[PDB]
Paper text:
Similar to all known parvoviruses, BuV1 assembles into a T = 1 icosahedral capsid. The gross capsid morphology includes pores at the 5-fold vertices, protrusions surrounding the 3-fold axes, a depression region at the 2-fold axes, and a wall separating the depressed regions near the 2- and 5-fold axes. The VPs have an eight-stranded β-barrel motif and an α-helix that form the core of the capsid, which is characteristic of all members of the Parvoviridae.
In order to characterize the structural rearrangements that may occur under various pHs relevant to the viral lifecycle, BuV1 capsids were dialyzed to pH 7.4, 4.0, or 2.6, vitrified on cryo-EM grids, and subjected to cryo-EM data collection. For instance, the large rearrangement in VR-IX observed at pH 2.6 occurs at the 2-fold axis of symmetry, which suggests that this may destabilize the 2-fold interface. Indeed, in micrographs of the BuV1 capsid at pH 2.6, capsids were observed that appeared “broken” (red arrow). At pH 2.6, when the virus is presumably in the stomach, Q157 adopts an extended conformation that restricts the radius of the 5-fold pore, preventing premature externalization of VP1u or the viral genome.
Residue numbers in the entry:
A (entry chain E), B (entry chain Q), C (entry chain P): 23 to 569
Write the structure that this text describes.
Amino acid sequence: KAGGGGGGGGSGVGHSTGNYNNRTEFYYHGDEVTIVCHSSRHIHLNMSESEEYKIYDTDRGPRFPTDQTLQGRDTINDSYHAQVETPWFLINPNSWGTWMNPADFQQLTTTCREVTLEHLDQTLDNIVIKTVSKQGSGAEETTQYNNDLTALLQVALDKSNQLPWVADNMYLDSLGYIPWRPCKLKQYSYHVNFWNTIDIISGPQQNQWQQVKKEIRWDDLQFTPIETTTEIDLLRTGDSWTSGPYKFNTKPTQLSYHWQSTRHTGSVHPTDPPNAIGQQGQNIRDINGWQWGDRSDPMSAATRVSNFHIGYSWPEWRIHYGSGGPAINPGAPFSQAPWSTDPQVRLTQGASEKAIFDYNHGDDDPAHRDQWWQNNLPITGQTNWAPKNAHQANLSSNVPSRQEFWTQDYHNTFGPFTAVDDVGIQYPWGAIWTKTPDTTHKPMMSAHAPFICKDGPPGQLLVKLAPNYTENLQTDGLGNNRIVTYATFWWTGKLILKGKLRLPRQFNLYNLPGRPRGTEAKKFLPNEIGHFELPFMPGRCMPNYTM
Amino acid sequence: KAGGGGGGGGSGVGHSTGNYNNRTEFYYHGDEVTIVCHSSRHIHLNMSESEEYKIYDTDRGPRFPTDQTLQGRDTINDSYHAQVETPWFLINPNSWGTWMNPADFQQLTTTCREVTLEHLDQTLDNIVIKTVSKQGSGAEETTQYNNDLTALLQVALDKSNQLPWVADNMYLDSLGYIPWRPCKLKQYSYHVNFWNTIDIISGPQQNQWQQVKKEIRWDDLQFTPIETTTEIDLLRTGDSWTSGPYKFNTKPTQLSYHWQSTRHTGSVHPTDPPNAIGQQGQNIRDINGWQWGDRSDPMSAATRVSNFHIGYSWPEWRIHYGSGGPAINPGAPFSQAPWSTDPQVRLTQGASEKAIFDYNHGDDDPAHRDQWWQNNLPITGQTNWAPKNAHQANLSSNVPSRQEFWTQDYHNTFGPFTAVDDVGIQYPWGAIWTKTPDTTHKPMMSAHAPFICKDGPPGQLLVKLAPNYTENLQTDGLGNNRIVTYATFWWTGKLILKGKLRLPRQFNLYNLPGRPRGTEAKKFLPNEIGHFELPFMPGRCMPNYTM
Amino acid sequence: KAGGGGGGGGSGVGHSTGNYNNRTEFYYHGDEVTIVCHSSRHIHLNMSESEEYKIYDTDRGPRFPTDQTLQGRDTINDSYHAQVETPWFLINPNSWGTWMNPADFQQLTTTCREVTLEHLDQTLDNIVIKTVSKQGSGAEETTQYNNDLTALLQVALDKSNQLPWVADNMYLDSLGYIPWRPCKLKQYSYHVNFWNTIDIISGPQQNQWQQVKKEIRWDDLQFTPIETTTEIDLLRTGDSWTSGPYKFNTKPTQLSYHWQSTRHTGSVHPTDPPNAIGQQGQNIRDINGWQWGDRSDPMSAATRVSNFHIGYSWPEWRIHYGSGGPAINPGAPFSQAPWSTDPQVRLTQGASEKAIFDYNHGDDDPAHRDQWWQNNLPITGQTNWAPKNAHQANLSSNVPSRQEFWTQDYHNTFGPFTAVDDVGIQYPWGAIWTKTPDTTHKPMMSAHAPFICKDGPPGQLLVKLAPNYTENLQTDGLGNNRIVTYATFWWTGKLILKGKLRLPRQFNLYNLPGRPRGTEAKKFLPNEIGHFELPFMPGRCMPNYTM
C-alpha cells in the first residue's frame, strides 16, 4: 500500500520514517479481553544470490537408503522435491513469540479461556542501503561501508493471495523471538509439479523398495513470478511502507485441555458410598439402564451406551507415499501419559511433534540447535493407542470366544459420533494461522496451526534489494555485473486478539506442572554473555470439563 | 428463579401452592402440529446420607477378571471409576414417557413425519417436610410423623451449565413413567479425573491382560460444589419454585425409517417386463451407462456408479480402552433382519441397544427388572456387517483372482460420500436431549439421544433437604447431629413440541409389525394388583423414501 | 436495622425469609477489578449458659511456672486475665476464607497488584427455634424436638461501636471456611481492668520471678451491657434482619512481596562486564561518588550513601511485661531464608506467626488441630537479624580497632529514614480488618490485619436466644427456670473489594514456590469421608520492585 511507518514522518535523507514499539497491552472489559501485540524487528537483507528465477530439483537428502539393507523402512528420510527459487525474500510474522514474550503468553493463558485473531498490520521503515568497497590486497585489505542514498528496496505484498502460500512456519522461517536481536531473511521459494513415487512393496518377496517415477513435471508446471503478479513498491531511504489493515476471519482456540474420555463423561455408575477412611465405593450389581448389545446382567460402565465418543483410533504414524513422495498422515493429538511406564521409553504415538530451533528462535546457544518434543501430556482423555483397542463379534451377557475377539487392528475409528480436539497453541515455535487448501472438501481441523483462515491468509510480504549494476553490464555476467549491496530496515507489526475471560470453575486451587516450576530458571534468563532459552507453554494449559 | 407453581397461590401454611396437570394436548394447524406435554409427579425426598462432599474411587464391579482364564476378554466388565458424591439430589425430566403415555406417542408417530423440541418449563410446589419420632423400645416402638413447618428445602438450577452435566438418562435415573406413582430421587454425583488403563496385549504371547495405571488424578482434579456455583433457593411449605422458560435450539428428528440401500435408490437396471403370472423380469444384457472400474461388459447393477453410499462399515463392537478404561465406540445403527436365519441366534451387530428397567419405568413387576433389547429391525437399508463385505484390486470385465480378493476386513467405511441415520426415539426408556461435548470438532450425530442441544442443555434441577440439627452439634458427629427428616413435594413440567404433518405418500395401506398387535395386551394394562408394562415404540415407525 | 433477607419475602410460618448465595463474582473494567464476595452460613445457636453478666478472673493457664526452676523465663506462659462474660453470642465475619475459597483467592492475587475493602452487608433469616423434650428414663429415654413458633431470637448490632471491640479473629472465633458446614457460635466477652505485673528481675541475684500485683481493678471497672447500649431486635420465625450497608474507609494492601534491601535498590556499583562464560564482573576500583564517613579509597557499595533504608532492627521477641501481664512487641516481618542453613533449625525471628486451627477453619481432621507457621519466606529484603548487625565508631579509609567495633546489640533501628512493609494477607486464617486504638498517636501499620479501619470497624453482630421460662419462675433458679432451647438460622453477607489490575512488568515468566505445586494435592481435596485441608496463600505473592 506503500504508506507511512512508526511514529515519524521521515521526509528525505536525515529524517526517521518510524519508531519502535514492541509493547503488548491487555484491555479488560467485562467478559472480554483485547490483547494488542506490538512487535518490532531490525531486519538485515543481502543481495539476491541470483537475479533469476530458477527451477530445479534436488537430491534425496541425508539418510535416504542407497540399498535394501533396511528394506525401504528408511525411505521415510526422503526430502526430494522440485521448486522455483525466487530472488525475493520473505518476511514471515507467523509464529507465537514473534509477538508475545513468555510473561505475556502466561498472562494470556491464565486470564483467558479462549482467544481469537482480530487484526494484523505491518510497516517497513528506516531503510538503510549500503555498498561494500574493498581496497587493499592481503593485509592492506580494507572494507569501506558507504551509504548508497539513491538505491532502492523492492516491496511486494499479496492481498489477493495469488502466489503459492508457503509461509506456514514449518522449518521455522519466521521473525525471531528476541526483540533486541537482528533478523536475517531467507529467500522465497515454492514447489513445482513433480512426481516422486517409491514402491516399498516391490520385489519378489515384496520387501524391497523401488523408485517408480522421480522427475519434474514440465508440461503441467506453473511458473508465476512476483513481477507479473503483484504491484511492487520501490523505496528509498526516506520512504516507508504500510500494508494496510488485515482482518482475520477465524474461529476461537480454546485455552484449556480436556481430561475426560467417555468413561469420565456422563452419568456415573450407581455406587454404594464408603463410610470409613481407606474404604472404597461399591458398584451396585442390580441397576437399570441402557447397555450396548444384547447385554443385560453385567451392567458394567464399560458397556453403558453413550451419545458420543471422545477420540478416535488411527493407523498411527501413517506414511502416505503419494505423488511427491512419502508424507505422514497425522492422526489425533493426545497424551501417552496414561500408558507410560518407563521414562526411558518414549511413546510418540499421540501425534506428538518436535521443534528444532536456533539462537534467535529461543535456543541459548549459537552454533547448535536445541530441541523440545511436545508430547501433549495434559491431553489425556482422547488417548487412543490403536493396538490397545479391540473388537468382538457380539456384546451380550456372554464373554466372546478366542476366535470372536480381535486385537491390534490399527483401524481408523473417526466417524459421525466422535468428538476430538486439535493441538492448540504451542507457544514459542508454533505457527499462528494457516491457509485453507482449495478443495471440494475443506479440512475440519488443523494438525498444527491453531487458526484456519476462512478467506485468505495475511498476505505474504516479499522484499528484494534492487540490483546495483556496475558500469559494464554483460549478459553473460551474473554477480560480477552487480555491486555488493546490503540493507538494514525496521519491521513493525500490530496483531490484535480478542479473548474470553477465564474465571474459577472449581473450589480447589488450580495446580500447574508447567514452566513456573523454578530451579530450572537459570536458563530462560540471560547469562553473562546474554544467552537464554525461551520456555515452552501450551495453549491448552488449565483443565476444563468437556461435557 | 424461585417462582409460583401450578394453579394455586399458596400463601403460608394451609394454602396449596400449585395444581396437578398431566394432560397432553395436540394442536393441528395446516402442515404443523403443536404437542404440549404436561407432566406432574409426586416426589419423595430423604435426607442426604452425608452433608459432606466425598471423593472416592470404586471396585471393578461384578464379573471383572481376577486372572487370565479368559485372557482379558472379560475386562469389558470394568465399572471402575472415581467420582465426587454431592449431598444434592437430581430431578431428571429427560426421558420419553416422563412426558407422553403410550397412546400419546402413538398419536405422535402416526400423525407427524418429524418433530422438534420447543420449550421446557418446570415448577416445584406443595412442599411437605416431616420428621420421624420413635417412642418405645421393642414392641412399644411407635413412629410418629410430625410436620416441621419451618424446615427448608434447598433448590438449585443451572441455567449457566457450570456443573458437570451427567443427566443423560443412561442408568435410567429419571422421573417415572406412571403419573399416579411416587418418585424417589437419587443423589447427584459426577466423575473426577482418574486413569484406568488395561493392557490386554500384555504378556509374552500378548494374550494376557495387565493393569497399567489405576488411580485418582489429584493434581488435575476439579472439585466444584453446588454452593459456590449457583444460587440456592430456600423454600418452606408455603413456598413454590419455577425454573422460568427454557428454549431448545435443536434439529428435528425424522419419525420414519429408511429401507433403501444404494441398490434400492437410483435409476433401475433396464429390465424386460414379464407378460404372464409367475414370470419374472429379465435384465437387458446390452445397455449403456456408467460402471465403476474399467468394467464394461457385465453392466450389472452392482457396479453401477452412484453419487452417494448409504451406510458404512465399522469395527463392530469396538472396545476403546482409553484413559478411564474400556468403553464401546458404537458404529452405525441398522437392522440384522436381512441376515437373520436362526431366531435363536441373536445378531447384536447393528449397534443395537438394551434397556434394563424397573417398576416405575414400565416393568410390571417389582423386585425384578424387565429387559427389552431394541435391535432396530425396520432400519434395514443401512445394514452393513463388516465381515460380509469385501474388496478387490481392480474392477474390470475380468473376475479377480483369489489373491486379488479380500474378505472379513473390519474396516471403517465412513467417508465423504456416505449417508447415514441415527437411531431416533426409543419411546419409553430413551433420553430426549443431550449436551454437546465442548471440543474443537463437535460430533455430527448422536448414538442415542435424538436431540442434540446446540447451546446448553436444560439446566439440572438439584434439590436438597436442609439438615435439621439436634441441640448438641458435635464436629465429630454426622447423622447423629441431625434429626431424621424427609420431604414430599410436587414436580410439574411443560414440554412443547413442533411436528410436521404426515400425509399418505402411497396408494396402498400402511401396515404395522409393532405393538398394536393384540393378544399380547393383557400386559400393558393394569391387573388386579395394578401392575402393568409400558410398550416399546420406535420413533422411526412408518417407512419412507430416502431418495 | 431489622430488615429483609436473601431473596425470599417470608411472611409468617411457612414462608422462607431469604435465600443462599455463596458465589463470588469478578468484574474487570480497565485497570480496576470489583470482587463481590457472597458468603452464606447455616448457624447453630444454643441457650446462654447463664442469663447473667458475670465478672471474674482466671488462673494463669497451663505451663505457667509454680517455682524458679526456669527462673521466670516461662512466665511468658501467662494467660491470666479478667473479663465480663455476656450472655450474647458473636457472629464474626472477619477472616479471609469466610469469604473466598482457595480458587477465588488465587484469582485475586494473580490478577491484582493491590486490593481495598469497599462495602460490607449482612442479613439473618430463616429462623428456626426448637425446644427439646425428654420422655423416658434409662432406655425409654426419648428426645422430642418441637418447633416453638412464638419463641424469639435477639439481635444487636453496633453501628456506633460503643461496645468493647474484641472481634479481631485472634483465637480464630469466626465463621467457618466451608460453605456447606454448620457454624456454632461462641459467647461474647471482653476484658475488664486488672493488674497483672510479674517482676522477673526480682531476688538477690535478680534471677527470680515474683508476682507484684495480680487483681481485678474494681474502682476503675467499666461494665457496659448490651441492653442499655444498643437497640435489640426481637425476631420470630417469619422475621429477618439486615444490617444495612457498611462502607469501609481503609488503605489498599499491596499483593506483591519486595525482595530489595538497600543493597538491591539504587545505582549499581560501576562494574567491568564479563566477556566470557563462567566469568564474573569486576568492580572498578577508581570511581567517584558519595560514601558515608570520611571514607574515600574503599569506594565499596556497602558504604555508598543512600536516601532511605529498608527494614529496621528490633529487640526481636520483645516481652513487654506491662499492666495486664507480659505480651510481645512484634517487630517488623521479614524472611529468615537468607540466613537459614539447617532445615531442622527453625528461625522464628522474622516476626513469624503460627496459626492453630480446626475442622471448620481448614483442618482435615476433627478431634485434632492442624498448625501452619507462616515464616514469610518471600519477604527477604527487609531481613534484619539484630545480632547480625554491628556498629563502629568511625567510617573512614581505616578499619576500626577491636574496641571501636560492636556486635550483637539488639537496638531498635526504626527511624525517620526507614521504609518497611506489613505482613499483608494470610489467606485462610488471617483477619481482614481491625479497629484503630483511640490514642493521641494512632499506630502507623498493623502487625497482622491488613486493613485498618479509619473511622469505625464493621459493627459487632451479637445474637442471643431469648429465655423460655417454665411455669415456676424462682429467683434462686438459673437454668432450671428455663426450657432447653436452641436455634438454627442463616447468615448471609456481601463483601465488595476493589483491586488494581496486575500486568506483566517483566520479560521472563513468573515462577511460583507456593501451593500450585501438586503431589501434595490429595489433601486440599475431600476424601471418602469428606475431610480436607485449606491451603495457605500469602497476600504478598508475586515479586515486585520497591524502588
